Structures are given as structure tokens and as C-alpha cells.
């Protein structure tokens, strides 16, 4: 069932390799599933603060 690209470390004389349905490669190629992106936080927003106002305070 699997293409030979997933069975390289396996020696086995598969007859279908000499027939029309060689199945050397996924053709058409398989879909590409993507892992969900890691979790990242905006830690710069915590730095957005007023400057020291004590020099110009009451």
C-alpha cells in the first residue's frame, strides 16, 4: 500500500514494482498537514509605560 519512498529500509521483491502500478512515489503527491503554530506572547506591550514624571510632578 505504502509507496517505496516509505519502505527504503526494507528489502522485499515486490512484483508490482515491474508492473503499471509501480507506486514508487505519491503521484499525485500527498497533502501537506501543518502542525499548529506554537504559542507566543507579546511581552513588549508590558514595556509601554509612561516615562518618569517625578521630575515634572507636583
Amino acid at each position: 500500500n505504502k509507496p517505496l519512498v516509505e519502505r527504503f529500509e526494507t528489502f522485499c521483491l515486490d512484483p508490482s514494482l515491474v508492473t503499471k502500478q509501480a507506486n514508487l512515489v505519491h503521484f499525485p503527491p500527498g497533502f501537506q498537514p501543518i502542525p499548529c503554530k506554537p504559542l507566543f506572547f507579546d511581552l513588549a506591550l508590558n514595556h509601554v509605560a509612561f516615562p518618569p514624571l517625578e521630575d515634572k510632578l507636583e
Binding site: 517505496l4 519512498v5 519502505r7 527504503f8 529500509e9 526494507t10 528489502f11 522485499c12 521483491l13 515486490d14 512484483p15 514494482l17 515491474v18 508492473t19 503499471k20 509501480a22 507506486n23 514508487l24 512515489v25 503521484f27 499525485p28 503527491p29 497533502f31 501537506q32 498537514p33 501543518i34 502542525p35 499548529c36 503554530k37 506554537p38 504559542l39 507566543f40 506572547f41 507579546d42 511581552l43 513588549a44 506591550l45 508590558n46 514595556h47 509601554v48 509605560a49 509612561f50 516615562p51 514624571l53 515634572k56 510632578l57 507636583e58
Partner: protein, 438 residues
């Protein structure tokens, strides 16, 4: 008239209280009282940043840069253009600053992450998490862990609920799936505990469940998990695009209704900024396959060509067009398209020759296919390849060449990895083959 020190005291009170809209309105009052004060301008741009109107803050900085001069508000405008998706300008803004500050270092790390320059980003985040102390250290650790996880997932180097999810991402990049599901169930437990001590933050954990389930082969469970993920209507857009794409990959040809309803979601607002280059590239990859499978070829070719514009990045997309040509009763054009691509890039050539050979086993010209398979150096000794080669050779009784391949593979393995299980398999089967025909 009211006293300016009184206005400053009340502005400080509003800022400490956390109210920023009224603080901004009174900063407007003080600045219309006195227009040539740098501190008032800094306070108003900070208020605009915290109010979420980055465009107005950037406008203020740009139109008051002449009066500002002096120390310059580099960090604030860098952050404003960052949150407006202007990261390239943020680079020069951080580099051109007069001096380096911890806020600038944090923003530098974040922009370096956003541009996938993971080596420098990891180094600067290590410096941040080492030499700076505050009450956001756990988020610093999860940011560094996300950096490492993305690096391992995409560039492929070995390395609370956020930490567990990030480690699951790193393990997924490393290929380990069962332990990833275990740590993901642990993160599920911690999410449940924190939420009981709202449902949107749940869905992302589930996002890494079904993708594992699909990776492990458990398609039926993964599809139901994706359906419940979408039925929850999560607020995230990038994760919605990822889930829609994974539903495409699970669906393949069947259930075109899911495929079209999910492609309706893959191209949404803000999608291009949350996802990475590799993820958007793969989404484009999947769009062309779906288009060829059910949609008209007029849009199948367009999407594949558009990705081919971005093709020099990675993840060779030529095969979509090759398969579309093969679907249009045109195989020689496909072979030429594969061949030229193989010639242009020499490091990518090996793996792509494998696809050529299969086509020349469709109805004939087997010997040329064996020649191509033999032409893949560094991969000729591999037992699966030698078995396929020997059976194709034996189709038209090309024996002596088959023994030649056997002995050259034996020599390769013996010089490289003597006494290997696969090498010993090859030697015993070579002895058997010599025994058969003499």
C-alpha cells in the same frame, strides 16, 4: 485655568489607576496648554499605543519628530510599526536607536522571531531570560520554548499549559507522536484545571490532538475532533486556517463540501500575519491539489504557478503541475518539466528523480527507469532501492547488471557500515541470487 503640576499629578494618578482614555484626554489638555514639552508627547504616544490606535501614535511620532530629536522615541515607534505588521522597518528602527534598552531587546527578540531568523532570535531571547528579571519570566520561558519548537519543526534541528503545548509542538517537529499526545493530554488537564479555577483557549490544544491523530493514521477520530474544534467557533484566525487545511489533508478527494467550506476559511483576514512562511506555503500547496481534484483546471494551474513564484523557498511544488499534465494525457511534457528542475538544483535532484522513474513504469521504458534509479547516488545502496532495481532488472532478464549492483552495494555498505543488519541481508541474498542462476 488650572495648575500644570496639578495636571501632571492627576495624569500620573490616571496612569497608575490604569485608565488610559481619560489620561489621554487630559494629556491632550496639557499639550494644548504647552505644546513644546517632550514628556507630554511621550505620554500621549504611550496612551495611544495602549488604546490600540497604533496608526495615530505613529502619526504623532512622525509629525513631531522635528520637535522631539534629543533621545528619540525609538522603542515606541518600533512597537507601533511592529503591531502594524511593519517588521522590516522595525529592524532598522531597533538597530538605529541611540542606545540599547531592555524594552528594545524584548522587541528585537519578538521581531527576530517574526522573521524566522531563529538563531539570532534564540540567542537574544537567551540573553533576555538570563540577564533580566521581572514578573513575566514564565512568558519569557514559553517564548524561548516556542522559538525552539518552531526551529525544530521547520528548520529541523534537534532540541504551565503553554509550556506543555510548546513542548508538544517541538516533539511533533521531532516526529515523536505518542509522547506528544501524552504531554498534550497533560496540557489538556492543566487547561481544564485553570479554567475551572473560556472555551476558546481549549480549542488550540485540541488542534494538536487531531493533527497527531491524522499523523498516526487515526483519520476517523481526527475528523470528529476537527469538527468539534470548528463547532466551538474559536476566535483565533490562524488556527482556524490551520484546522481548515488539516481538514483538507484528511478529506483529500472525498467530501468536497468540507473542502470548499474550509478553503472559505483558509484565506481570511489577518491569516498571512499569524502563520509562518512554511505554513502558508503548505496551505498554498494544498489549495492546488484540491483545485485539481474537484475544481476546474483553470484555477488549479494558477495556484500552483503562484506557489511556483515562491517555490525557490522550499517544499518543491513542481509535482502538482506534473501530475496535472499527467491528468491531461501529457506525460512527455511532465518528464521534461521534472528533468529540467532536476538539472537546475543539484542538492534537491536525488529525491525528485524518484518521481521520474515511476512515470516511465506506467506502460513501458522500464530500462530507462532503472537507469534513473541507479543514477540517484548516495541512495543506490539502500535495500528497498536495490530490491526494486533487481526485480525490474529481472523483468527483462538483465542479470549480470543486477549482480553488479549487488556487489557495488555490498562494497558500499562494507566500507561504510560493516556487519550491518541490512548489509548482511544484502550479502546473504546476493549469495542466494548467485546460487540460483550460477
Amino acid at each position: 485655568g488650572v495648575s500644570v503640576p496639578a495636571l501632571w499629578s492627576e495624569v500620573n494618578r490616571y496612569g497608575q489607576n490604569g485608565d488610559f482614555t481619560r489620561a489621554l484626554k487630559t494629556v491632550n489638555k496639557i499639550l494644548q496648554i504647552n505644546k513644546d514639552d517632550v514628556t507630554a508627547l511621550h505620554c500621549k504616544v504611550v496612551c495611544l499605543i495602549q488604546n490600540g490606535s497604533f496608526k495615530e501614535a505613529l502619526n504623532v511620532i512622525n509629525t513631531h519628530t522635528k520637535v522631539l530629536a534629543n533621545n528619540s522615541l525609538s522603542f515606541e515607534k518600533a512597537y507601533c510599526e511592529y503591531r502594524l505588521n511593519r517588521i522590516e522597518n522595525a529592524l532598522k528602527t531597533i538597530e538605529s536607536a541611540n542606545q540599547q534598552t531592555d524594552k528594545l531587546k524584548e522587541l528585537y527578540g519578538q521581531v527576530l522571531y517574526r522573521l524566522e531568523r531563529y538563531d539570532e532570535c534564540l540567542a537574544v531571547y537567551r540573553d533576555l531570560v538570563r540577564n533580566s528579571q521581572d514578573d513575566y519570566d514564565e512568558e519569557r520561558k514559553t517564548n524561548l520554548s516556542a522559538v525552539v519548537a518552531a526551529q525544530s519543526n521547520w528548520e529541523k534541528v534537534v532540541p504551565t499549559h503553554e509550556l506543555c503545548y510548546n513542548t508538544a509542538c517541538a516533539l511533533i517537529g521531532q516526529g515523536q507522536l505518542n509522547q506528544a499526545m501524552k504531554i498534550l493530554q497533560k496540557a489538556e488537564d492543566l487547561c481544564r484545571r485553570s479554567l475551572s479555577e473560556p472555551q476558546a483557549e481549549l480549542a488550540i490544544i485540541h488542534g494538536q490532538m487531531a493533527y497527531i491523530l491524522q499523523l498516526q493514521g487515526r483519520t476517523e477520530e481526527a475528523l470528529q475532533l476537527y469538527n468539534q474544534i470548528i463547532k466551538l467557533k474559536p476566535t483565533d484566525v490562524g488556527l482556524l486556517a490551520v484546522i481548515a487545511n488539516n481538514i483538507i489533508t484528511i478529506n483529500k478527494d472525498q467530501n468536497v463540501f468540507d473542502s470548499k467550506k474550509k478553503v472559505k476559511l483558509t484565506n481570511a483576514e489577518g491569516v498571512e500575519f499569524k502563520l509562518s512562511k512554511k505554513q502558508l506555503q503548505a496551505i498554498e500547496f494544498n489549495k492546488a491539489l484540491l483545485a485539481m481534484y474537484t475544481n476546474q483546471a483553470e484555477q488549479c494551474r494558477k495556484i500552483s504557478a503562484s506557489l511556483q513564484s515562491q517555490s525557490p523557498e522550499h517544499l518543491l511544488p513542481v509535482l502538482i503541475q506534473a501530475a496535472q499534465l499527467c491528468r491531461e494525457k501529457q506525460h512527455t511534457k511532465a518528464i521534461e518539466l521534472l528533468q529540467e528542475f532536476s538539472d537546475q538544483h543539484p542538492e534537491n535532484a536525488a529525491e525528485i528523480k524518484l518521481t521520474m522513474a515511476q512515470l516511465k513504469i506506467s506502460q513501458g521504458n522500464i530500462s530507462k527507469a532503472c537507469l534513473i534509479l541507479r543514477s540517484i547516488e548516495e541512495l543506490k545502496h539502500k535495500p528497498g532501492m536495490v530490491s526494486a532495481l533487481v526485480t525490474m532488472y529481472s523483468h527483462e532478464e538483465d542479470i549480470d547488471s543486477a549482480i553488479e549492483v549487488f556487489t557495488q552495494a555490498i562494497q558500499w555498505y562494507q566500507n561504510h557500515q560493516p556487519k550491518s543488519p541490512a548489509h548482511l541481508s544484502l550479502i546473504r541474498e546476493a549469495a542466494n541470487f548467485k546460487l540460483k542462476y550460477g
